[PDB]
Design a binder for this molecule. Structure first.
Ligand code: NI
Length: 434
């Protein structure tokens, strides 16, 4: 057909280049990566069921490089153009996260690949927030922010050319893809020289730290780059030793044998200077578990809400031991047995033909049902890994405004997970001659 490289390959290259750039900017991220590699190796050696799970699903091959980035943009035009940038790399907008409820003036989506085979090549995602200026109730401050943002140009001209070329021609060859990665990366580099005076920076920063982080800098620098660990409890035990003491409160469900959604915590990664005069860069670590169905999401939200009620306040470091204890107690009601998670329809799964099943594929007399094939060892299942982010604690005007700015509708992650599960069952049926 042509000599264009796969968008998935460009995404893997971009993720790797972002990681190297960020490590140069933020040395403690490199320290974290060394700790993640050690923890993940220990889990695989000590927990054969985890090793097997990751082999069945192919995640063992993607795990070591698996990351997400987080960025913030300031204008609708920036969001729409960044969607085009990410589309070069096979990344589509999935989900919608509105923090206007929680008092933070942003709403967001995550750009990611959508199909398990693409995700296998690279599961890189970029959580992308758009600052909302209407929620600023000091008119002169809103005007200042709008004027500063209006005239900045966060994309290099060469990046924009290669985005347009990709769209018109249907892809990029290896040399143009390499140029694209380098040009795109410039958008996300740290720049110490602010675009505002110290006075302006002060007024923006007291309105909300996030407003200054967006408006005062030349572009959308990396807010964090998060590697994936197989055991966030283990990494937390190793992180004080390395000078990145994390928040004791871990976001997400408590420890489980069969994790759900994700768990995450944060740490201070670097004190930076801003020139017109200091600002912190924070890091993050995450552990990714099973994607939940609508039913599972409803149960999750209910138990998390009950934990917060029992806490009597806001989860903070001062109450961390008590919070974590209440979280475990309340989440006892979420089944922690994979068979029940499947039978009760709480999580999405992938199904695989086993060696035993394949060897029996020409037999009559085999079990006539999916459960019967599982029971006889012909089909094996594992949870489908969650690719998205924790929901905002909980009509459509905000999502509609976001989608108008984005230039398309966000994809429904639950529909995408259902499709992954279905494709696995179809592939298993073909492999087993059913
Ligand atoms: Ni994050």
């Amino acid at each position: 057909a042509n000599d264009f490289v796969s968008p998935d390959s460009i995404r893997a290259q971009f993720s790797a280049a972002m990681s190297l750039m960020y490590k140069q900017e933020v040395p403690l991220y490199g320290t974290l990566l060394e700790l993640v590699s050690e923890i993940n190796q220990q889990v695989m050696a000590q927990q054969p069921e985890v090793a097997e799970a990751l082999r069945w699903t192919g995640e063992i091959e993607r795990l070591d490089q698996e990351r997400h980035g987080a960025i913030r943009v300031g204008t609708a035009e920036e969001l729409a153009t960044i969607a085009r940038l990410f589309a070069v790399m096979g990344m589509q907008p999935v989900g919608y996260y509105d923090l206007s409820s929680a008092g933070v003036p942003v709403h967001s989506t995550a750009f990611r690949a959508v199909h398990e085979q693409s995700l296998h090549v690279s599961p890189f995602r970029v959580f992308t927030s758009l600052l909302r200026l209407e929620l600023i109730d000091n008119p002169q401050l809103r005007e200042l922010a709008q004027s500063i943002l209006a005239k900045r140009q966060i994309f290099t001209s060469r990046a924009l050319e290669l985005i347009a070329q990709c769209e018109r021609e249907g892809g990029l060859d290896a040399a143009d893809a390499e140029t694209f990665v380098q040009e795109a990366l410039h958008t996300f580099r740290w720049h110490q020289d602010a675009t505002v005076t110290a006075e302006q920076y002060q007024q923006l920063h007291d309105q909300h730290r996030l407003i200054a982080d967006v408006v005062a800098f030349k572009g959308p620098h990396i807010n964090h780059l998060t590697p994936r660990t197989l055991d966030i409890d283990a990494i937390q035990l190793g992180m004080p030793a390395k000078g990145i003491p994390p928040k004791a409160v871990v976001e997400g469900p408590p420890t489980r044998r069969h994790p759900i959604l994700l768990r995450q915590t944060s740490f201070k990664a670097l004190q930076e200077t801003v020139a017109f005069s200091h600002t912190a860069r924070f890091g993050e670590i995450e552990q990714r578990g099973a994607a939940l169905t609508p039913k599972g999401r409803q149960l999750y939200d209910k138990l998390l809400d009950a934990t917060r009620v029992a806490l009597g306040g806001a989860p903070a470091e001062a109450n961390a031991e008590r919070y974590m204890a209440l979280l475990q107690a309340n989440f006892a009601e979420f089944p922690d047995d994979l068979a029940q998670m499947r039978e009760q329809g709480l999580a999405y799964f992938r199904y695989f033909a086993t060696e035993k099943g394949l060897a029996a594929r020409d037999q009559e007399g085999r079990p006539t049902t999916l459960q019967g094939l599982i029971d006889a060892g012909h089909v094996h299942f594992e949870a489908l890994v969650y690719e998205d982010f924790l929901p905002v604690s909980a009509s459509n005007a905000n999502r509609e405004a976001f989608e108008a700015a984005l230039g398309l509708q966000v994809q429904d992650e639950l529909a995408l997970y259902a499709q992954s599960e279905r494709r696995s069952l179809q592939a298993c049926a073909q492999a087993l001659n059913l």
